[PDB]
């Protein structure tokens, strides 16, 4: 208890009532005495036990048969019976393809930090549980990228590799995203390319990558299968769609030489379904403009171009109160959105995205009894209070199935 | 129950929080649900029994603050408050405790980005006040001192504490200086839509409204639980700034102005178990409070179409970011205007930068700093300010400013 929880929207006075939070399972890290809502990561070869796994699978199977309006049927009981026996005789169990598709869509649906969840039920699930080698992983991932890119008309997809077993046979993508640019720490302390990727770039070079040492080098895939040491693969360049950034008004903006890739595809999170742990589960969607235009380009520890853009705008940069940073930021974000649209590559501005999410969230409250949301992540990094989410109260809690974080593999891997 | 670390992800600075171990009011979150974006998470007079421990704890931390813990003065100041809660069901704060309590409420204000200034706070003890006329007197002295011809100075005025619920001092205004908002026949709003109800309540009490766009509201002052009385602030005390733009000469043609003095007057100050239901307090503005929220909220002055229209921007699709462009211009105007009229104002880049510096001070000397990221990050340009990337721990320390019910919903007239 309590059975009911109200959220208000302070721009429209609309009030919603949440009962879904009663099904939350994991801890948030908050207590009655302290709130950790702005902490990024709250919360070994160790794996669930038989007794731990029984209730987690039952809970998930019950949920799945509830969703197909067959709860308590004979099929329901026989699925429970089958799974309880696998767990007894093998200490693990295998999802039916229909449960694997359900669990993945619902991990997306339950992702409280995702603003794009109105699309959750339209998600292409690529079952890759038959993969046994890194080459096989590389083939599955290329088909993922091609399907998802779709010549600019991007479609959301996830590829799911074999689940963890004893913890020593994990499948991992070592990339944090399938497509990222490389970062090269120079001897003089400067950074070429993407500073966020300096460490991963160095691991790739050590594993034998020959870097072109440019500003926008796509990194190779580093892929670990069945617990073996990882292996480098170059993504075929014709499968990486990229967009040159230009500005509709400023002639000079193309002279900055900026570009970005089309397909955002997280590959380092763990997918938890019914107590099973899919440690390799790359998933992709399309970009919200500000992810590129504010964070990737203007974060001080990223490409950090505000200074250069402001100079070409001839803004007063001597004091902060001129708001030269804020002016350049908007123009950079107009250019990003202009470029992706002109190339007919799918992208969504932050106004459209937040407005869609408010509608999604209301529908979820209406049809499901709630929608976990992380205000700190849902609100866009620019122009927050002129998007509907800023004024929207949100409840954050953890439903399963879910995408979770997991430690970087180089910290844990045992080299053979 | 450990030390907790917070990390800034831009600078990779890590601070260790021990202070949260001393908090005792609830946040409203649980281990299963986080509520950090709820605005108001969840006869309100404590009895004698609740009151002494609260009081004992406040006196304890006061004497600990002045390096005289367990002293003679401390031993006897305790017995004094014990005896007093006994015989009167309440107790009275010394002048020094009142000032320390007030400054430390500001210091514990998790939602306040401005707290680098917490100890430069002018405290006006108005606990001898007994009537709305006396309240109006103390308030005009506040406004005049805090305005200071444009060199604004932080201040609080503290009216008598709650006793039995029936004798309650309240400023019915949410802020000492606000513009009236008028419901129109055609259904629209002239002036500030945020105060449409309150504007009607003052009309219902005899206020003749100029029905203009920027009408300063009267004070509605309730003393000792009586019906509230209206008062006109002497206009020579209300400092305003006409908003113009340093590039666009058509911006003055918008006819916009705002008041220099932001003064919250609807909150409750809680010190040592005592409740000061009238405690108006004031500082100076961060430019976004006016330029983003007051001017560009939908439920507020809502001037964005107008501005981008005179900027001749493409307003057909959202992805021209025509709202984002017009918002930066409006906020440049606001900052340029105050600075040109030498009225104290702070931009959100400098204010968040100061707050990070304040956070370092507080972790160093106090072992923490409760901070509400949802409220600390500015309503525009978030991730180009240092606070966006700063992890924050939010917890509830007393003394504290609390919310209280709107007065019109509680008051039974006679
Ligand atoms: C289809 C369009 C999509 C849009 C517009 C979108 C948008 C976003 C954005 C802006 C974030 C914040 C990311 C950040 O700032 O780092 C996010 C987070 C996230 N998204 Fe979505 N996303 C989409 C698709 C998906 C899909 C297909 C999945 C999974 C099947 C997904 C799962 C997640 C998860 C788990 C997070 C949390 C990431 C983290 O904690 O680092 N998203 N999304
Ligand atoms: C001196 C300059 C100051 C600045 C620049 C400043 C800035 C701010 C800002 C931007 C907010 C968020 C306001 C909102 O969105 O409603 C805020 C909230 C707050 N401030 Fe400060 N402030 C200052 C002085 C003060 C003083 C003197 C006090 C008390 C003595 C104070 C106590 C508070 C409280 C309690 C809140 C939270 C109000 C709420 O939750 O509604 N501030 N401040
Ligand atoms: C499936 C999916 C769809 C969409 N749209 N976004 C994501 C998040 C991944 C993602 C997020 C961002 C924003 C800036 C990030 C980088 C550091 N800061 C947290 C930049 C990317 F390049 C990226 F790939 C996942
Ligand atoms: C003491 C003190 C100093 C400073 N600088 N700010 C405050 C907050 C008060 C305050 C805050 C705002 C923000 C816009 C509206 C939308 C929500 N919020 C009420 C608009 C004001 F007009 C105002 F007065 C208090
Ligand atoms: C729902 C949410 O709590 C609400 O809109 C908050 C968000 N953060 C805020 N932050 C500030 N500074 N001021 C506000 O009024 C709000 N409103
Ligand atoms: C400190 C804070 O938790 C952290 O910087 C968060 C803020 N909100 C965010 N929101 C999104 N979408 N992505 C982020 O990386 C962050 N970073
Ligand atoms: Zn919380």
Give CA–CA dist B234/B356, Å, rounded: 39
Q: Please indicate if the annotation marks B374 as binding a ligand.
A: yes
Q: Please indicate if the annotation marks B403 as binding a ligand.
A: yes
A371 carries an active-site annotation: no
DSSP letter assigned to residue B109: -
Please answer yes or no on whether B32 and A34 come within 8 Å at the CB atom.
no
Here the tokens at position B58 are: 């406040």
Measured between alpha carbons, how far is residue B413 from residues B11, B226, B266, B410 in Å? Answer: 57, 7, 19, 10
CA of B230 to the centre of ligand 2 (A): 26
Q: Are B183 and B61 in contact (CB under 8 A)?
A: no
Atom from ligand 4 closest to the CA of residue B293: 14
Give CA–CA dist B352/B383, Å, rounded: 11
Residues B232 and B132 in one domain: yes
**Residue A363, domain CATH:** 3.90.340.10
Measured between alpha carbons, how far is residue B7 from residues A41, A359, B108, B348, B364 in Å? Answer: 10, 34, 20, 21, 15
A291 carries an active-site annotation: yes
Residues A329 and A247 in one domain: yes
Neighbours of B112 (CB within 10 A): 19
Its sign, for the CA torsion B354, B356, B358, B361, is: negative
| Nearest residue by C-alpha to atom 4 in ligand 6 | B389
Residues A204 and A237 in one domain: yes
Residues A236 and A141 in one domain: yes
Nearest beta carbon to residue B391 from set A39, A325, A337: A39
Q: What is the 3-state secondary structure (H, E, C) of A156-205?
A: CEEEECCCCCCCCCCCEECCCECCCECEEECCCCCEEECHHHHHHHHHHH
Of all helices (H) and strands (E), which one includes residue B8?
Answer: none
CA of B293 to the centre of ligand 5 (A): 10
Q: Are A195 and A301 in contact (CB under 8 A)?
A: yes
The resolution in Å comes to 2.2
CA of A371 to the centre of ligand 6 (A): 20
Residues A85 and A182 in one domain: no
Q: Quick check: bond before B5 cis, omega within 30?
A: no
CA proximity to A222, closest of A202, A235, A245, A204: A204
- CA dihedral of B277, B194, B384, B152, whole degrees rounded to 10: -60
Does any domain span residue A9? Answer: no
Phi, psi dihedrals of residue A126, rounded to the nearest 5°: -105, 105
Question: How do B181-183 and B170-171 pair as beta strands?
Answer: unpaired
Does any domain span residue B341? Answer: yes
**Residue A201, domain CATH:** 3.90.440.10
Domain that holds residue B357: 17-127+154-164+268-282+352-376
Helix A306-313 / helix A324-342 crossing angle, nearest 10 deg: 100
Residues A32 and A124 in one domain: yes
Q: Are A39 and A30 in contact (CB under 8 A)?
A: no
The pick from A105, A116, A154 for probing ligand 1's pocket by mutation, whose C-beta has the most ligand atoms within 8 angstroms, reads: A116
Q: Are A165 and A92 in contact (CB under 8 A)?
A: yes
Give CA–CA dist A231/A224, Å, rounded: 7
A114 carries an active-site annotation: yes
Does any domain span residue A392? Answer: no
Q: A79, A99, A109, A114: which one is catalytic? A: A114
Q: Residues with Cβ < 8 Å from B326, sequence gap 6 or more?
A: B304, B307, B308, B311, B313
CA of A177 to the centre of ligand 1 (A): 12
Chains A–B, number of C-beta pairs less than 8 Å apart: 202
Residues B30 and B160 in one domain: yes
DSSP A259-319: EEES--EE-SPEEEETTEEES---EE--EEHHIIIIIIHHSTTTT--HHHHHHHHT---SS
| Total domains in the fold of chain B | 3
Does any domain span residue B392? Answer: no
Give CA–CA dist A39/A27, Å, rounded: 13
Here the tokens at position B74 are: 């401390």
Please answer yes or no on whether A382 and B384 come within 8 Å at the CB atom.
yes
Nearest beta carbon to residue B321 from set A322, A330, A375: A330
Helix A50-67 / helix A74-90 crossing angle, nearest 10 deg: 160
What is the three-class DSSP state of A217? coil
Q: Residues with Cβ < 8 Å from B87, sequence gap 6 or more?
A: none
Does any domain span residue A213? Answer: yes
- Closest residue on chain B to A325 (Cα): B384
Q: Residues with Cβ < 8 Å from B48, sequence gap 6 or more?
A: B85, B86, B89
Does any domain span residue A397? Answer: no
Does any domain span residue A393? Answer: no
Here the tokens at position A71 are: 């709860």
Its sign, for the CA torsion A268, A272, A275, A280, is: negative
The pick from B15, B389, B394 for probing ligand 6's pocket by mutation, whose C-beta has the most ligand atoms within 8 angstroms, reads: B389
Neighbours of B197 (CB within 10 A): 12
Give CA–CA dist A176/A20, Å, rounded: 31
Residues A138 and A225 in one domain: yes
Please answer yes or no on whether A289 and B319 come within 8 Å at the CB atom.
yes
Instruction: Tell whether ligand 4 has an atom less than 6 A from the beta carbon of residue B294.
Output: yes
Helix B322-340 / helix A324-342 crossing angle, nearest 10 deg: 170
Give CA–CA dist B13/B11, Å, rounded: 5
- Ligand 6 pocket, CB under 6 A: A 38, 40, 376-377; B 9, 388-391
In the numeric block, the tokens 């005899």 are attached to B206
Residues A203 and A224 in one domain: yes
Residues B50 and B158 in one domain: yes
Q: Quick check: bond before B200 cis, omega within 30?
A: no
Q: Residues with Cβ < 8 Å from A100, sequence gap 6 or more?
A: A125, A127, A129, A160, A273
Phi, psi dihedrals of residue B271, rounded to the nearest 5°: -125, 135
What is the three-class DSSP state of B396? strand
Q: B104 CA to chain A: closest CA distance, Å?
A: 19
Does any domain span residue A7? Answer: no
Dihedral-angle region of residue A257 (phi above 0 means left; psi in -120 to 50 means alpha; beta otherwise): left
DSSP A119-147: GTTS-EEEE-TT--SHHHHHHHHHHHHHH
Measured between alpha carbons, how far is residue A304 from residues A384, B91, B166 in Å? Answer: 21, 58, 59
The pick from B142, B181, B262 for probing ligand 4's pocket by mutation, whose C-beta has the most ligand atoms within 8 angstroms, reads: B262
Residues B289 and B337 in one domain: yes
**Residue A317, domain CATH:** 3.90.1230.10
Give CA–CA dist A386/A336, Å, rounded: 20
Please answer yes or no on whether A34 and B384 come within 8 Å at the CB atom.
no
Residues B229 and B309 in one domain: no
Neighbours of B122 (CB within 10 A): 16
Method: X-ray
Give CA–CA dist A216/A238, Å, rounded: 15
Q: B160 CA to chain A: closest CA distance, Å?
A: 30
């Amino acid at each position: 208890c309590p059975r009911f929880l109200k959220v208000k929207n302070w721009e429209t006075e609309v009030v919603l009532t949440d009962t879904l939070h009663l099904k939350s399972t994991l801890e948030t890290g908050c207590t009655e005495y302290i709130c950790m809502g702005s902490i990024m990561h709250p919360s070994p070869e160790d794996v669930a036990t038989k007794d731990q796994l029984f209730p987690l699978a039952k809970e998930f199977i019950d949920q799945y048969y509830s969703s197909i309006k067959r709860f308590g049927s004979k099929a329901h009981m026989e699925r429970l019976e089958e799974v309880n026996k696998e767990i007894d005789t093998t200490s693990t169990y295998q999802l039916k393809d229909t449960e694997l598709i359900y669990g993945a869509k619902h991990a997306w649906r339950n992702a409280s930090r995702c603003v794009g969840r109105i699309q959750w039920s339209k998600l292409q699930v690529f079952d890759a549980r038959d993969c046994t080698t890194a080459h096989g992983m590389f083939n599955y991932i290329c088909n993922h990228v091609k399907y998802a890119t779709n010549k600019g008309n991007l479609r959301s997809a996830i590829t799911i590799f074999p689940q963890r077993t004893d913890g020593k046979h994990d499948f991992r993508v070592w990339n944090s995203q399938l497509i990222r640019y490389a970062g090269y720490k120079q001897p003089d302390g400067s950074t070429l390319g993407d500073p966020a990727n300096v460490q991963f770039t160095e691991i790739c070079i050590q594993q034998g990558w020959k870097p072109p040492r440019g500003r926008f080098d796509v990194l190779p895939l580093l892929l670990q299968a069945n617990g073996n040491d990882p292996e480098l693969f170059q993504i075929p360049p014709e499968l990486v769609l990229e967009v040159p950034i230009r500005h509709p008004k400023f002639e000079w903006f193309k002279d900055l030489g900026l570009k970005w890739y089309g397909l955002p595809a997280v590959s380092n999170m763990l997918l938890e379904i019914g107590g099973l742990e899919f440690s390799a589960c790359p998933f992709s969607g399309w970009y919200m403009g500000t992810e590129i235009g504010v964070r990737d380009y203007c974060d001080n520890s990223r490409y950090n171009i505000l200074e250069e853009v402001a100079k070409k705008m001839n803004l007063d940069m001597r004091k902060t109160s001129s708001l030269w940073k804020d002016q350049a930021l908007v123009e950079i974000n107009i250019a990003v959105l202009y470029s992706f649209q002109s190339d007919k590559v799918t992208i969504v501005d932050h106004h459209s995205a937040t407005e869609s999410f408010i509608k999604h969230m209301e529908n979820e409250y209406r049809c499901r009894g709630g929608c976990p949301a992380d205000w700190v992540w849902i609100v866009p990094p620019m122009s927050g209070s002129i998007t509907p989410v800023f004024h929207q109260e949100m409840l954050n809690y953890r439903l399963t199935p879910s995408f979770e974080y997991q430690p970087d593999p180089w910290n844990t891997h045992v080299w053979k």
